């Protein structure tokens, strides 16, 4: 479909018969516009006290993100976890609740196209708990740019249990905005990602929010092929089979290769 799908080598798996079928992916974002003809939202929950409906995306964020998961893993079961409000901001508690819901709800993949500058013990316990449970936890690295020799990587992405996804363009080049550091795991396409928008729309968005779902989507592709495989197995598969870009501080392991990861 869109360039980022080809880039990650997704199509090669679609042809072979691997589309993410029977994989449960939670999008912990501003909701998903379930009304979108293309989007099949299987369920969800809201943790935003003022925004009761998970299936309503007042931002556009969550709908775009969900769209990306679906283009990579078209047969995957999408779950909308509303943690962010119309403004794009959310409480750490709302987020924790969203992680907890995903665990309790037997999610296979968590997508967190979100990040903050500071962490919490409650945050780390939650993410680490998702991992202990067998969930593949995906998060954007952040859009912090550089800070000399300092890690720019936001939370929950900073955490080792969480796959930290940075951004590349269609030329395999690091996006200027892309958070850097030892904590950066993988690179996925995040420059001008054309996806689903609320109210039967499509539009381009840039950021690590865009890169993350490509990995969340890639993870669902591997689980469709290897149903038996642990989160640990999925993650290793992804990280170990990458297209090596520059330095690890900037690129991590490089670009994901869904085709090589699926063996």
């Amino acid at each position: 479909v869109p360039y980022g799908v080809s880039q990650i080598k997704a199509p090669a798996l679609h042809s072979q018969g691997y589309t993410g079928s029977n994989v449960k992916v939670a999008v912990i974002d501003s909701g998903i516009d379930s009304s979108h003809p293309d989007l099949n939202v299987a369920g969800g929950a809201s943790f935003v006290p003022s925004e009761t409906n998970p299936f309503q995306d007042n931002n556009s964020h969550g709908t775009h993100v969900a769209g990306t998961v679906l283009a990579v893993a078209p047969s995957a079961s999408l779950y909308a976890v509303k943690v962010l409000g119309a403004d794009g901001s959310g409480q750490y508690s709302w987020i924790i609740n969203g992680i907890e819901w995903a665990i309790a709800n037997n999610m296979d993949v968590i997508n967190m196209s979100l990040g903050g500058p500071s962490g919490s013990a409650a945050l780390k316990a939650a993410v680490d708990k998702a991992v202990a449970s067998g969930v593949v936890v995906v998060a954007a690295a952040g859009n912090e740019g550089t800070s000399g020799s300092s890690s720019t990587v936001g939370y929950p992405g900073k955490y080792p249990s969480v796959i930290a996804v940075g951004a590349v363009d269609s030329s395999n080049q690091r996006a200027s905005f892309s958070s850097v550091g030892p904590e950066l795991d993988v690179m996925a396409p995040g420059v001008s990602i054309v996806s689903t928008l609320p109210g039967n729309k499509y539009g381009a968005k840039s950021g690590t929010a865009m890169a993350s779902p490509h990995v969340a989507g890639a993870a669902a592709l591997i689980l469709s092929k290897h149903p038996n495989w642990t989160n640990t197995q999925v993650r290793s598969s992804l990280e170990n089979t990458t297209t090596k870009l520059g330095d690890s501080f900037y690129y991590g392991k490089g670009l994901i290769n869904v085709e090589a990861a699926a063996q």
Partner: peptide
């Protein structure tokens, strides 16, 4: 936490 903010949208990425």
């Amino acid at each position: 936490a903010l949208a990425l």
